[PDB]
Amino acid sequence: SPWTATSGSCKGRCFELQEVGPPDCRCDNLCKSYSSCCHDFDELCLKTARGWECTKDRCGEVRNEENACHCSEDCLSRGDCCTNYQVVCKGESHWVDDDCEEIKVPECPAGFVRPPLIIFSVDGFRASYMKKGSKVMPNIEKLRSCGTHAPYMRPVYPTKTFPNLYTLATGLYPESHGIVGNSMYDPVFDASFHLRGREKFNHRWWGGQPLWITATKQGVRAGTFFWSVSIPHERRILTILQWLSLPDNERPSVYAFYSEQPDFSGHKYGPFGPEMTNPLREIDKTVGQLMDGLKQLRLHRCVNVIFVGDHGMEDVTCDRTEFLSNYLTNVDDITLVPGTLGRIRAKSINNSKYDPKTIIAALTCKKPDQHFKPYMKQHLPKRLHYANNRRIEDIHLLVDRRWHVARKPLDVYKKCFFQGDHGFDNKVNSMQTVFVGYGPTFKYRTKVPPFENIELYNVMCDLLGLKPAPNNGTHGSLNHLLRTNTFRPTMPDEVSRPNYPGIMYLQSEFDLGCTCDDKVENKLEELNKRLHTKGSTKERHLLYGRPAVLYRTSYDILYHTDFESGYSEIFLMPLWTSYTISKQAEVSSIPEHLTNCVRPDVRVSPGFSQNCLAYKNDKQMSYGFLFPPYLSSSPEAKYDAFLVTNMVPMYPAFKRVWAYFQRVLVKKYASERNGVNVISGPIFDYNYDGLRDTEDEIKQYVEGSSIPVPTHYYSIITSCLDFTQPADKCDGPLSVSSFILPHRPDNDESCNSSEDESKWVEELMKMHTARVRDIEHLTGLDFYRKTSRSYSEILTLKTYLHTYESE
Numbered sequence: 001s002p003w004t005a006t007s008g009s010c011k012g013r014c015f016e017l018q019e020v021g022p023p024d025c026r027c028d029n030l031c032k033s034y035s036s037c038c039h040d041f042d043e044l045c046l047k048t049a050r051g052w053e054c055t056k057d058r059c060g061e062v063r064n065e066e067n068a069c070h071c072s073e074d075c076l077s078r079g080d081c082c083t084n085y086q087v088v089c090k091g092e093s094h095w096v097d098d099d100c101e102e103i104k105v106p107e108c109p110a111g112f113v114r115p116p117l118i119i120f121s122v123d124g125f126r127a128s129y130m131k132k133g134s135k136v137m138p139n140i141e142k143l144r145s146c147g148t149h150a151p152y153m154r155p156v157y158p159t160k161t162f163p164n165l166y167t168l169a170t171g172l173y174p175e176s177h178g179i180v181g182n183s184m185y186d187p188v189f190d191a192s193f194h195l196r197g198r199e200k201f202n203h204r205w206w207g208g209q210p211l212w213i214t215a216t217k218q219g220v221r222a223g224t225f226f227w228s229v230s231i232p233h234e235r236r237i238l239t240i241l242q243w244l245s246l247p248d249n250e251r252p253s254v255y256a257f258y259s260e261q262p263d264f265s266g267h268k269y270g271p272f273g274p275e276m277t278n279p280l281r282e283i284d285k286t287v288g289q290l291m292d293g294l295k296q297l298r299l300h301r302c303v304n305v306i307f308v309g310d311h312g313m314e315d316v317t318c319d320r321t322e323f324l325s326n327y328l329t330n331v332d333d334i335t336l337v338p339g340t341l342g343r344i345r346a347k348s349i350n351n352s353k354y355d356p357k358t359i360i361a362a363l364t365c366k367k368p369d370q371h372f373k374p375y376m377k378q379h380l381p382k383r384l385h386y387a388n389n390r391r392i393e394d395i396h397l398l399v400d401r402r403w404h405v406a407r408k409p410l411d412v413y414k415k416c417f418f419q420g421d422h423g424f425d426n427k428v429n430s431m432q433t434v435f436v437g438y439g440p441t442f443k444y445r446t447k448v449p450p451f452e453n454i455e456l457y458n459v460m461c462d463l464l465g466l467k468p469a470p471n472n473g474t475h476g477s478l479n480h481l482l483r484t485n486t487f488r489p490t491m492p493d494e495v496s497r498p499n500y501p502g503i504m505y506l507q508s509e510f511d512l513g514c515t516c517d518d519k520v521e522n523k524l525e526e527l528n529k530r531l532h533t534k535g536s537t538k539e540r541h542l543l544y545g546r547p548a549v550l551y552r553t554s555y556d557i558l559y560h561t562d563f564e565s566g567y568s569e570i571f572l573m574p575l576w577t578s579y580t581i582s583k584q585a586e587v588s589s590i591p592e593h594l595t596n597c598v599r600p601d602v603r604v605s606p607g608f609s610q611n612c613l614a615y616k617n618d619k620q621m622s623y624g625f626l627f628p629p630y631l632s633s634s635p636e637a638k639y640d641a642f643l644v645t646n647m648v649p650m651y652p653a654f655k656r657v658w659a660y661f662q663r664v665l666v667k668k669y670a671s672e673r674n675g676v677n678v679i680s681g682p683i684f685d686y687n688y689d690g691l692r693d694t695e696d697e698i699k700q701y702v703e704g705s706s707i708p709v710p711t712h713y714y715s716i717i718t719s720c721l722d723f724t725q726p727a728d729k730c731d732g733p734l735s736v737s738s739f740i741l742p743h744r745p746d747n748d749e750s751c752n753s754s755e756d757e758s759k760w761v762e763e764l765m766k767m768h769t770a771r772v773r774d775i776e777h778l779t780g781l782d783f784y785r786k787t788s789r790s791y792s793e794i795l796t797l798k799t800y801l802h803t804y805e806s807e
């Protein structure tokens, strides 16, 4: 390691805020972790004498600087009283014993320019501990009941510690901030990141801009967020309280506490082992020390406190391990990053025999109850946002909750007794964690719906008056947590205006190789057809306004009896198709005579249309329709569903999924939700960056054509939250579920796909559930432009994820 001159001194420097560089010895809260503290750091900065609590006998003692904390009359002015000083010595109450009283305005001491923010972060604090441990956590239960709380907060994938803490700090997905696991190899650096050792302290791992840097760059001082493991929790609290006693111009406005518990014990004992009660009690006692200490400093109605976890904890035992050696012939030629997720790469880049395709195949649906599923990273559910980083191996194993994956059996017993772990898919209930906000800027006695931890950075910025660095939150989506300091964004400006084409082409101008048995012949209904094509039913089918197109392109709005679309002249297909299905709608067949019907659209030039010949010649690719012919309002309207402008390229394997969605599931949802509005369309994300591809990024076309092949198909399914009102006459808040289905040429993902669609398609769709915001990123469209609802409410709706977990 680098040389440090430990012969310097921490006198007058204990828990200094500014870092000093090698070779200078350190006195900060992380110095122990770098083995670089000055020789007298323990003696001066980690005093322990007489413990952490005042007692009657110590009240008004002569100050003894040796003591861990003080009970002398000068201690409040020095800022170093034991947290219970005023209770024991001055007849005050513990904070927890005081009634909840609304904090309508900050009540801060003179010299405080803004309410400080204290983040109280807890590792492995599973969401359900707030109910199941409530009898042993009175301080936490008071924060929860009196402040603003969610029933749970969704972590990021993988549900590991450093990825989640750093997402809290940055607002970024792991793929963007770079901490993609607790273990990583970076092929460009040729460097490895591990929990143990020095490499993880190198700045090149840590991307984005974390909150303490955002603060500092904008003139807001920060406490150092990382605490060496051996610093007792009592000392971390005392350190924060001492910093809060610094002069105004020296004093931070943002702070973080961290606890390794309950994660540490949860690994040993399982999430609900009897041994878990004590760690929860201890954390609660720490919270009480903080709050008593704030009360002493007259800050308990001034500071905003966030109580937040990184991830939950699941029951996992050594016996529930899958071994790759039971699947692969070649297990010595791979490197596996193991555990609650798998990542596989070649052991040697000089091995020309390594082949990811044969590895995937050998891992796919090989054992009936197989407890992991292999994916190429681009095929992972888009909601995980887990692909666009060179540190993420191409081959990924999604491991079932309660299981591990390992390379060989000896890997498990050459080192177990553990009973808990985490890392699984971030929709899994056991992985959910906690959020409580308490203070003047948060709401009083308020429950908010579950939300994702990527959203918190923005809020913490709002709490501190900071402009957030660019991040993956949706700023304004959490305004409903806040009494004040809301962020009031404007809707993005539409970049491309639509064309509204009329009838401009004769049938014979088209030479598309299409056919349709549609030659059948009325002045009464002549006018009706013309009205429908000029948009007379658009209010029924486009319920929340046209989506706005946020990039430069050429597209047409096309109206029909049963659906409206925004048709791209560049991609030769809709960007979006919008239609409403009432609870009373009937499903019908595709008539025998229309099975292979495709019809030219006389509003759209031959040159801006798909053609049927390309599909005939492309022996791998077929086609489907975005507005489903099955849900036509009448036999005559059904002809509109067969327009070439409603056609999209679909692999036969995918058509099985799509047809079941369209013929069975849409009507099921309309029945259950009292009507639904559906917006469906293609997505192109060939570079797996979560963002709309430009034309030049497209890697596959329908053979012999310029018709690009989507990587995914989306649908956004909206109805009235009050399901006593039909989707098309909803006066209040909305309810949404969405999906982003991978457009794959096989159903290998679905191990039961040989069975009828009723046994597997809906399961696939649930796995590929999505937020509206995910679709916005992937399409460059902006939805819900014209509703009766507040914009912040709509932002919340766009971040909603339908998870399909139990309670």
Ligand SMILES: *[C@@H]1O[C@H](CO)[C@@H](O[C@@H]2O[C@H](CO)[C@@H](O[C@@H]3O[C@H](CO[C@H]4O[C@H](CO)[C@@H](O)[C@H](O[C@H]5O[C@H](CO)[C@@H](O)[C@H](O)[C@@H]5O[C@H]5O[C@H](CO)[C@@H](O)[C@H](O)[C@@H]5O)[C@@H]4O)[C@@H](O)[C@H](O[C@H]4O[C@H](CO)[C@@H](O)[C@H](O)[C@@H]4O[C@H]4O[C@H](CO)[C@@H](O)[C@H](O)[C@@H]4O)[C@@H]3O)[C@H](O)[C@H]2NC(C)=O)[C@H](O)[C@H]1NC(C)=O
Pocket: 172, 173, 175, 176, 177, 178, 204, 205, 206, 207, 208, 385, 388, 389, 390, 470, 471, 472, 689, 690, 691, 777
């Ligand atoms: C979630 O939120 C985040 C944040 O808003 C979104 O990420 C942004 O998306 C942008 C598009 O993908 C991306 O913009 C690019 O930035 C390039 C330079 O970036 C550097 O500087 C910024 C600013 O300080 C910094 O944040 C970057 O940090 C990344 O890289 C470092 C390593 O150096 C990492 O430590 C860090 O974690 C982060 O890595 C992540 O992003 C990079 C991409 O930058 C990925 O590769 C990583 O895997 C990881 O995900 C950088 O230090 C900039 O140079 C780009 O400009 C090109 O594009 C335009 C397009 O027209 C073109 O005109 C330009 O000429 C240029 O092209 C030329 O270079 C091409 C690339 O080599 C070349 O092929 C061409 O031929 C051209 O010569 C571009 O603007 C932005 O960096 C990230 N920011 C972050 C923090 O990740 C993210 O999209 C959101 N996610 C979702 C789903 O919404």
Ligand SMILES: N#Cc1cc(Cl)cc2c1C[C@@H](Nc1ncc(C(=O)N3CCC34COC4)cn1)C2
Pocket: 033, 119, 121, 165, 166, 167, 168, 169, 195, 210, 225, 226, 227, 228, 229, 256, 257, 258
């Ligand atoms: N990023 C981030 C972030 C974001 C928020 Cl909102 C709060 C906090 C954080 C960070 C956290 N402090 C914290 N985390 C981990 C550790 C830890 O593990 N350490 C220190 C040495 C070892 C490495 O192995 C043992 C210590 N301290 C408090």
Ligand SMILES: [Ca+2]
Pocket: 123, 124, 160, 161, 162, 263, 310, 311
């Ligand atoms: Ca953790």
Ligand SMILES: [Ca+2]
Pocket: 684, 685, 686, 687, 688, 689, 690, 691, 692, 693
């Ligand atoms: Ca893309």
Ligand SMILES: [K+]
Pocket: 615, 616, 617, 618, 619, 620, 621, 622
């Ligand atoms: K074909």
Ligand code: NA
Pocket: 747, 748, 749, 750, 751, 752, 753, 754
């Ligand atoms: Na299958």
Ligand SMILES: [Zn+2]
Pocket: 124, 161, 263, 264, 267, 422
């Ligand atoms: Zn852990």
